[PDB]
Design a protein around this ligand. Structure first.
Ligand SMILES: [Cl-]
Ligand SMILES: [Cl-]
Ligand SMILES: [Cl-]
Lengths: 368, 368, 368
């Protein structure tokens, strides 16, 4: 309602759902508002699959970066001439190019998996589909749409054998249950096939007693990220803590909440509908799985009720600067010239400058 | 009708047409469907001019790559400070930048020329116009839209002389007939003026008894192509042969048929209009001059009735992978893990894997 | 009216206006016509502030390049960890990234400042807003849209003190008057903070007795410009002089008139609304502050009534070529093959070629 920047579950539709897991696909941002039209090629998926199961083979006509949000997983990318599976624990990023086959298995015996992917449609600005080689309960094989003669010619065989072996609809859809022994071989064995990145790998950018913010960037370091102009981020906010009023200089963040709960403040600037320019606040209640859009140069503050884990997909990331409006470091206001503050602000300069030296910590403080 | 991916002649309008040749311009893809909205800046032209004739001088506000589809030709690019004509035989690519003057002459005495260009509009997303310095039967000179004073001032002369020499409407339009002797001097003499590429130059990517596929890529090799993110391709399919079910990982191909005829299978994935996802086939009859769009990650199979020559302009080409769904090499299904196939497909793993080792050739086989 | 390419003052709305200056923002080009849809992310601002005043602190969610059009100025960019002010005299370009704080002061005692900026919206294709940390008569502080608790928590203080010092609405809006002494310290002290470029720095590209054209390009030289694919230009046309019929091979120029007045000829190519292709002229009267769009491959001629200063922001600038249709140098017509002219033009080749050697100067001549 009030908030076009906040998307919870009811905005999440369900493409596929059985007792072994489910796959949610978030609606095209360019509907609710043109406030972020420039995000329209970025569609969000969230996946959840029970222990010892598997998301079946397919590919999309959409670029993809994939990230382990809860639990444990063994993912496989596949090529025309190459396969290459990896095991990914949480806060691990993997990139599945377009047209490349891939499947995900929940390595874990007792605990779950809750994978979150961004998708990037190639053909149609807002749209991507899946292509399954295998038919099943919930979808159809893309080889069924071929001819009797071609299939036979292609595969060197009669229609009956191809059909009986490959085409027939068997499984209860796109996520099926797996043996324990079968798993030991899929794991056993764990190009444009990039290696999996760890989003927490180095020393975190922002860090103190109340919070942490890891961030991988479009760099000479990571060649892939540089190619997409896209940064990946992870924020962790302690219970009772406050991520202070801040913003991103230029990146447009699609944030999605891993776990926990907390308190969103987003502040926009609104032409109605010498025209009055309005500072309208927007707030929202954050819960496991929620999503909030965080446009460029727009201030936000976030307070954690619970131990709060956030994931952040950044667009237009190159040379981004997360600027802060309070604290010792990354304080942008502090940097303003002293006569600059004196004239702008109601108070004197030295007084206004004194209130800035008042808050002596940096990025995260105690909420209250 | 049924097929939005298939464009034949009736989709081709005619911008210019006389007894010495004609120029066809294919309608904006973003009309029929938003299924390939992202192709809207790519407009197709096809040109046909008799022996010993010439397409007259002009430029467009549209980038351009040009390719000899049938016959023989001598093409001239021109600059503010430089001219540079080349002779191009078939399967030769030439790039005419934006704002650069150019004309084409049919070098050949008895045989024709059937040039195919892609155009890339600079100003308006879907639209480009021609600018002719000379007036004629079918169009007007862009200097006529200047003033009496300016022209005179610019050119150092009275209006009468400028008009009599340059402006007056003379020719039967934009393609005129040429002398034999005149030709010997235009040929005699055969910057941002790039040299002409040969699309068949090296050793072909795919090759056997039934087919060939040459392809030039956006590479450290070809600097221009790298700049456009655009690959050029040529496929040759023998009579009776089958280009197996395949697709492009990420590139969006605008294919155009040089010569011959054959059998198009295109397989899409269709949301109508937990929603049913439909494998809808699309087919089409291919004839000299036809065009079919070949979106990313979408399977196609093509069988040649006649000796079939195809041209392919690729978009989003960088690190493309043409993936194949049948054959020894570039077989993507083969690469799937063995337990992966067993669970997905109706058959067992070893059985499903046996049907793959059945077809022992690679990319092209005998259709029937 | 008649001209969609010509935008004068009445097209310029007023975002902010007091006795100490004013800020004009030109309407989104994608309204009047889709003739330049591809310019829709480029919005024009023009600023005018009296001697000894200041445009107050803010940032936008829009990239920005800024240029001194008349007078003298001291500009400050600011960061989360860095400030860096420069003094800029006319024809000086400065780049203010997105999310970065900045303010402008009129250094001069008796003379004015008339700054012209291009803005580039990050979030919404055509739209950018300002974000002021300080509240005032004409706008509101973006910290007012925060909460009682957060502000207090963030800043380490009660609501009263924060409000009294920082939040309260004090000034007569966004441009205020400054002391003489205050100025001596702001000037006294005169990252992603780029140094200021001089657009007249080297030896001018085009130059003679009647005109000058300076131009900075997207180069290995200027790294920033290369990043934006954007060239900056300055043209100076003598009273009575003529900038000859010319055009840009590929760049789309947003031109804005610094000072003087003169005579615009723009020549388009018009499908109505084997279709008739029309050379329609467009003209316009140019006055201090006017703006005219100059699409790619489109001819223009400009004659100066008065000493005429033009500013030019180029889009799609990489490897642009300004091509000329008259004069010794950059004459594109001259470059056409001799048999090429003979057939195209009404006259013979040698005659048509003689009228080209007639005008012996290059780029600027005497209008009449
Ligand atoms: Cl963030
Ligand atoms: Cl192809
Ligand atoms: Cl210009």
């Amino acid at each position: 309602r009030n908030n076009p920047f906040y998307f919870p579950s009811r905005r999440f539709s369900t493409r596929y759902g059985n007792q072994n897991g489910r796959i949610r696909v978030l609606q095209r941002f360019d509907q609710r508002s043109r406030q972020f039209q420039n995000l329209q090629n970025h569609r969000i998926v969230q996946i959840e699959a029970k222990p010892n199961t598997l998301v079946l083979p397919k590919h999309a006509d959409a670029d993809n970066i994939l990230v382990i949000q809860q639990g444990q997983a063994t993912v496989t990318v596949a090529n025309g001439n190459n396969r290459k599976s990896f095991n990914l624990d949480e806060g691990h990023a993997l990139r599945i190019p377009s047209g490349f086959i891939s499947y995900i298995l929940n390595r874990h015996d007792n605990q779950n998996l809750r994978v979150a992917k961004i998708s990037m449609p190639v053909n149609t600005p807002g749209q991507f589909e899946d292509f399954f080689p295998a038919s099943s309960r919930d979808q159809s094989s893309y080889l069924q749409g071929f001819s009797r003669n071609t299939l036979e010619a292609a595969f060197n065989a009669e229609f009956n054998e191809i059909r009986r072996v490959l085409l027939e609809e068997n499984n209860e859809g796109v996520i099926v249950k797996v043996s324990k022994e079968h798993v030991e071989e899929l794991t056993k064995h764990a190009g444009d096939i990039t290696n999996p990145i760890n989003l927490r790998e180095g020393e975190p950018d922002l860090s103190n007693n109340f919070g942490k913010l890891f961030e991988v960037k479009p760099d000479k370091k990571n060649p892939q990220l540089q190619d997409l102009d896209m940064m990946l981020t992870c924020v962790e906010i302690k219970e009772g803590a406050l991520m202070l009023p801040h913003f991103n200089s230029k990146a447009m963040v699609i944030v999605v909440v891993n776990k926990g709960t907390g308190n969103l403040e987003l502040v926009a600037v609104r032409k109605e509908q010498g025209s009055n320019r309005e500072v309208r606040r927007y707030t929202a209640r954050l819960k496991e799985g929620d999503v909030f859009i965080m446009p460029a140069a727009h201030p936000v503050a976030i307070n954690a009720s619970s131990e709060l884990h956030l994931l952040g997909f950044g667009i237009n990331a190159e040379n981004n600067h997360r600027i802060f409006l309070a604290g010792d470091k990354d304080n942008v206001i502090d940097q303003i010239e002293k006569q600059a503050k004196d004239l702008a602000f109601p108070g004197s300069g030295e007084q206004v400058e004194k209130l800035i030296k008042n808050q002596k910590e940096s990025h995260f403080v105690s909420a209250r």
